[PDB]
Design a protein around this ligand. Structure first.
Ligand SMILES: [Mg+2]
Ligand SMILES: [Mg+2]
Ligand SMILES: [Mg+2]
Ligand SMILES: [Mg+2]
Ligand SMILES: [Mg+2]
Ligand SMILES: [Mg+2]
Ligand SMILES: [Mg+2]
Ligand SMILES: [Mg+2]
Ligand SMILES: [Mg+2]
Ligand SMILES: [Mg+2]
Ligand SMILES: [Mg+2]
Ligand SMILES: [Mg+2]
Ligand SMILES: [Mg+2]
Ligand SMILES: [Mg+2]
Ligand SMILES: [Mg+2]
Ligand SMILES: [Mg+2]
Ligand SMILES: [Mg+2]
Ligand SMILES: [Mg+2]
Ligand SMILES: [Mg+2]
Ligand SMILES: [Mg+2]
Lengths: 114, 247, 49, 198, 114, 114, 49, 114
């Protein structure tokens, strides 16, 4: 039968250096080519709250629904998650610093079709 | 006129009940689009080109661009059907689905207007980009000049539009339509599929039928001016004859 | 101010009405082509199977 | 001319009535059904519906189609890709493509409107058993059938077709226009027909 | 051999903000393009009961079978689910608030073929 | 290189409301289009035994091999299993009520090729 | 020449505002590109090319 | 229906023998054909720190964001990672020796599409 090599779908990342004490990385699936994302990795540099938000607006974040998914302490990586967001469902992931000082946040995952 | 309805099943010898044509109207109110330009008599003399002729051409072109804005703004805002692509299947399938929406309201579209981003996506569609799937390499080869681009989905005409043409309210003196013209982000309207005979561009001029160009000399300041005007509206007769394609 | 059209739209002139009446929705008519048509002699009848 | 316009409306309204009686009989009294259950809704569903009629030993030659079904059918890669269709006519001319009147052994495509089926929502009409549509579970979106096994029966006491009559009311200063036609629709063999179900 | 890049199938989400005390998010696979869904993530905002229902009706919910799958307490995310529903099998997922106060519910997952 | 969106294969479910005390849901992979199934989820409404059976008959259940896979107590869901059955291998999954009273059973999973 | 713009929606009897053609230039300054070569009469004779 | 055999996407590895005490293996997704990577395995040879970095430069590492993901002690394998990096998002993985002596580091994984 026909043999095909599967390479895995588009890499996605969001990052910010020196996120101030109460500030956040907003992971926006509008930055994806396919307009949806699945975040696997949050490497956080210091303590963070991870939050899943729905917007009232198609294009900007105006909070409708908000759920704090988890709180992470100190420096490390949460690896192998599936937290999912799309542009058309207006879903955003916010990673908020809670360290008392500036941190580097790198979030990686994969683009998903809408 | 009201839509055609259905006769009633009736008993023998029973009274025939009435359901006559109801009527309504669509109003036009033509907005005066104007464009001006001023040149000093010294620059008029010294310039290598006819600056007045150049400015007459600019004024005419600016009014034509205005007609196109009024048209596209009506067309996008007042279309009564919409195909939401949800960021997916955005090429031929979206056009076919938009034609399907108009077909479901029992109209037949024949034209589409398209944003540059929508054109770009449409020409990336494997159904058109692959000569195999298109029956024709003309989209790969000649892009928008391919006869199939003026022939997809039962449509006779492709009206390629510019990005700046829709009223975003970002241009000076223009107040903005309700939508976004684009194909970049959620809720952008990137194409309209419609019946060319069911949307009306209404042109009024007091002193003729089309663009009026007037000139004036200021003897106090040594300035020659050129002013253009036209009154334009655009209205759908049947807005159900059109469907927007939404990102 | 001066005289302008928005002041006198129903006093010095009337808004134009087009003599064209624009048609409503037209439904697809296919039954006559898409079936066997019997012109019956009676409103009630039978066909043998 | 409001009388001429109303005469035209009356004639059209009666034709729409014939089409309603036809489509309601056709959809309700078809003895076979292909349940697509979402999934393979384009050419495969037509072929499967022809298969149901073939299994009851009849040969269909016509299909009647809802706008949503047409839309799904023209999104089918077997028709949309010129490669797979053998022609680019569906990609270009869509419903006007000669292949759309020549699919799955069928000779005729009868494109119908969404409003034609008797939902029972229109005044004076009592409703058929089904839903005409192709956007929710259990909707019937196409009928594949033998055109010679379904009969539209037209009766008029005067002449052959629509009778339009007019009257003046001298007491009220009203002119009236009344149209009439008698219609039935019946299958001779309802087994010659299959609905396609969402 | 041929190489192909595989991007993952359509993102699905249902969400509600300010769901009142005993009210629910009804996740309907009729909202999916493919007409079936797999919910991976439930971000719950407060305490919820998750319930899987079969309808007698093809298109509306009239309860035939109903099973309370699990109860979640407090705010958080249930990650790595595979709760599945389809239109043609008339299956619905109901997420019911049990918090004593209003909550935000976000359910995300993937569309599946019927 | 060529990009394809992979949507996941056909949803499958079997369900019964009001399964009497000793009665069962028989999950038959003959009901699948592809003629094989992989059950992921058993949502059970009360106590059940799950059982994998081979038939002597190509179309009906006449027990040959029968293995009780597991026993589930009370109400809940066993999620993310891979219990597999096919038409041509005469394999069946039986979920038997053991509650002492009537229960609702919903089983979901995916169709697999034979 | 400056880009084509859009006309202004204007009230009746209001002033027509100016947006005339603005102009600029692009300058060229052509750079002298040069190449040279020298050959002796003896090498010119003796070479086969 | 059509049957296709799926072979898995391009293998990626980075390695260094005799990495000196404070030195590092820099895993650069520029070395991948697809320009993105997912590291699954780190075979560490001795104690190491794993670090995820974003560069200011498109082509060279000039540190912007840097997060120390985890520390491994002694010889072994970190199996089952999904640490991701791409060229276009200028992301690098650094594995730094912390053993007090020279070690062999092998990292393996898969190429991912950008
Ligand atoms: Mg959005
Ligand atoms: Mg809230
Ligand atoms: Mg949207
Ligand atoms: Mg009476
Ligand atoms: Mg009426
Ligand atoms: Mg409509
Ligand atoms: Mg009789
Ligand atoms: Mg039969
Ligand atoms: Mg054509
Ligand atoms: Mg259903
Ligand atoms: Mg029950
Ligand atoms: Mg069904
Ligand atoms: Mg035994
Ligand atoms: Mg068998
Ligand atoms: Mg066998
Ligand atoms: Mg002034
Ligand atoms: Mg300007
Ligand atoms: Mg780079
Ligand atoms: Mg730093
Ligand atoms: Mg770059």
């Amino acid at each position: 039968t026909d043999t095909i090599v599967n390479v895995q779908g588009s890499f996605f990342s969001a990052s910010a250096s020196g996120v101030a004490d109460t500030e956040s990385l907003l992971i926006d699936p509008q930055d994806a080519k396919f307009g949806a994302i699945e975040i696997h990795n949050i490497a956080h540099g210091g303590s963070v709250d991870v939050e899943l938000l729905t917007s009232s607006d198609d294009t900007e974040l105006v909070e409708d629904a908000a759920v704090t998914l988890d709180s992470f302490t100190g420096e490390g990586i949460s690896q192998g998650n599936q937290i999912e967001a799309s542009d058309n469902t207006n879903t955003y992931i916010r990673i908020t610093n809670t360290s008392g000082g500036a941190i580097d946040i790198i979030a990686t995952g994969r683009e998903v079709s809408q | 006129a009201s839509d055609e309805e259905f006769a009633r099943p009736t008993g023998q010898g029973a009274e025939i009940r009435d359901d006559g044509e109801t009527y309504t109207t669509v109003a036009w109110n033509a907005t005066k689009l104007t464009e001006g330009s001023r040149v000093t008599d010294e620059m008029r003399d010294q310039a290598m080109v006819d600056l007045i002729e150049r400015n007459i051409q600019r004024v005419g072109a600016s009014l034509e661009n205005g007609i196109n804005r009024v048209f596209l703004t009506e067309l996008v805002d007042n279309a009564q059907n919409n195909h939401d692509t949800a960021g997916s299947n955005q090429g031929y399938q979206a056009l076919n689905s938009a034609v399907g929406e108009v077909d479901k309201d029992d109209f037949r579209p024949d034209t589409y207007v398209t944003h540059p981003d929508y054109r770009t996506q449409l020409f990336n569609d494997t159904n058109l980009a692959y000569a195999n799937r298109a029956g024709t390499n003309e989209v790969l080869r000649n892009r928008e000049d391919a006869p199939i681009v003026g022939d997809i989905a039962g449509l006779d005409m492709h009206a390629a539009m510019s990005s700046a043409t829709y009223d975003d309210g970002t241009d000076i003196g223009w107040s903005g339509g309700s939508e976004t013209w684009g194909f970049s982000s959620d809720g952008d309207k990137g194409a309209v599929v419609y019946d060319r005979d069911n949307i009306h561009t209404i042109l009024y001029a007091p002193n003729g039928q089309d663009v009026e160009i007037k000139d004036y000399e200021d003897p106090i300041r040594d300035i020659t001016g050129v002013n253009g005007r036209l009154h334009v509206d655009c209205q759908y007769s049947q807005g159900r004859s059109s469907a927007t394609v939404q990102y | 101010f001066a005289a302008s059209d928005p002041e006198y739209v129903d006093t010095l002139f009337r808004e134009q009405l087009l003599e064209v009446v624009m048609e409503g929705r037209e439904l697809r008519k296919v039954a006559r082509e898409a079936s066997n048509v019997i012109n019956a002699n009676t409103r009630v009848g039978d066909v043998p199977i």
